[PDB]
Design a protein around this ligand. Structure first.
Ligand SMILES: O=C(O)Cc1ccc(-c2cc(C(F)(F)F)cc(C(F)(F)F)c2)cc1
Ligand SMILES: O=C(O)Cc1ccc(-c2cc(C(F)(F)F)cc(C(F)(F)F)c2)cc1
Lengths: 13, 212, 212, 13
């Protein structure tokens, strides 16, 4: 799983 | 308009500013974060399945960062401006042993961008196109990404015909830097894999993840 | 016309027709000869200094051969037709261990060529463009090769607007296969260097020379 | 020197 790429992409803002 | 160039340009303006290869890598990793913010400001990108968003940026990130720092360097002589604010000169690049790829960036991208005075609306559009890569392996719906890619280059062609009517092949010209961008991307990636493999160089975590 | 599409098309028509990787390599070497004949039939190519002619074909040969055999395969399902007359299927390619690059050729070039029905005038023009690569390192006069590249894509744009008026982005579409062509070229070259390095495979002399 | 490439390119025909 691409942890960081995924966490940046979910976040509104 | 299903794809106004206006919004692509705001996307660009929105995300806007000692071993040279350590510096380049710090910059790269920093800019990976700025890239995700940029892509979200591109019309319709955020509407795609989370999976495809991931595939596109995993596919595009290298070419997109090279496009940014090349267009950022148009004013600069024989060198590139990193997002860190720090300029790297070709002398520094040859002396770290990355002169070949460096020279290729100068001659194939920076110089060409300077010579034609590629505006930030055009950079945006080319980067937008690179993002909507229907060739990206694994996409849930390639047709949709094709169709978005189609909207972008249609918009750009009209932007060029309207803004630079004197230059009827400016559109083609712009599209014929994507091959050079593709080559230089892969050579850069081959280099970054080596910095990792060898551990000669610190690789910050997000760049690290893009190389796994 | 300084660059009539008519003559580019005759160039194409003029040069026109058990380990699969041995077969591919035999074909490649055979076609290298056909390529030099093709390039000579391209308007103005033969007028360039012998040095630049050499630089261009040394630069282009890989992409140009891939363009040929991709457009030759449009009719074929899940496979490529070699100049030898022999078809290679994706099953044979995976089983020699070149399925990844093979699949990339099918999906990024053949399929796209089939889907849009890229005619031989267009193949010719794209190949002509790849030939007139002003990025080629060492050229006596890049401006001239730029200017020839410019004549080709101008001619093609008008050929498309005239021949396929229904498809106003056909021109762009065509130009946006050159990046995929650039990628697949370099991956093919990485493979051919390995067949050589390893000596697993016979490498006939002209292909041999293109790899030195 | 690219022997073969050079010999193909000189020859008229
Ligand atoms: O400031 C930025 O936009 C980010 C950013 C900045 C720099 C590079 C870069 C990477 C490489 C690499 F990976 F091969 F070593 C080489 C070069 C270059 F050729 F020297 F120009 C430049 C990638 C991204
Ligand atoms: O018949 C021709 O036009 C010449 C010609 C024919 C075939 C290939 C070819 C080369 C490679 C290589 F080098 F990676 F192994 C791979 C493939 C492919 F991916 F399997 F399709 C095809 C080059 C040139």
């Amino acid at each position: 799983k691409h942890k960081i790429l995924h966490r940046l992409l979910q976040d509104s803002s | 308009m299903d794809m106004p160039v206006e919004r692509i340009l705001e996307a660009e303006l929105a995300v806007e500013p000692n071993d040279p290869v350590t510096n380049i890598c710090q910059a790269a990793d920093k800019q990976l974060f700025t890239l995700v913010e940029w892509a979200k400001r591109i019309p319709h990108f955020s509407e795609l399945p989370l999976d495809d968003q991931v595939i596109l940026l995993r596919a595009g990130w290298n070419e997109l960062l090279i496009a940014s720092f090349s267009h950022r360097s148009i004013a600069v002589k024989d060198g590139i401006l990193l997002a860190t604010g720090l300029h790297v000169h070709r002398n520094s690049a040859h002396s770290a042993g990355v002169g070949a790829i460096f020279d290729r960036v100068l001659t194939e991208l920076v110089s060409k961008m300077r010579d034609m005075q590629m505006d930030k609306t055009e950079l945006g559009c080319l980067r937008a196109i690179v993002l909507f890569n229907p060739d990206s392996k694994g996409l849930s719906n390639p047709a949709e990404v094709e169709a978005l890619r189609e909207k972008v280059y249609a918009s750009l062609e009209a932007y060029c015909k309207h803004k630079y009517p004197e230059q009827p092949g400016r559109f083609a010209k712009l599209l014929l830097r994507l091959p050079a961008l593709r080559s230089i991307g892969l050579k850069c990636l081959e280099h970054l894999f080596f910095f990792k493999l060898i551990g000669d160089t610190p690789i910050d975590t997000f760049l690290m993840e893009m190389l796994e």
